[PDB]
């Protein structure tokens, strides 16, 4: 999911 990505942790 998203959130292991950090260029994704927004929102998660």
């Known amino acids: 999911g998203c ?3 950090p ?3 927004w929102r998660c």
């Open 3 to 5: 959130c292991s990505d």
């Open 7 to 9: 260029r994704c942790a």
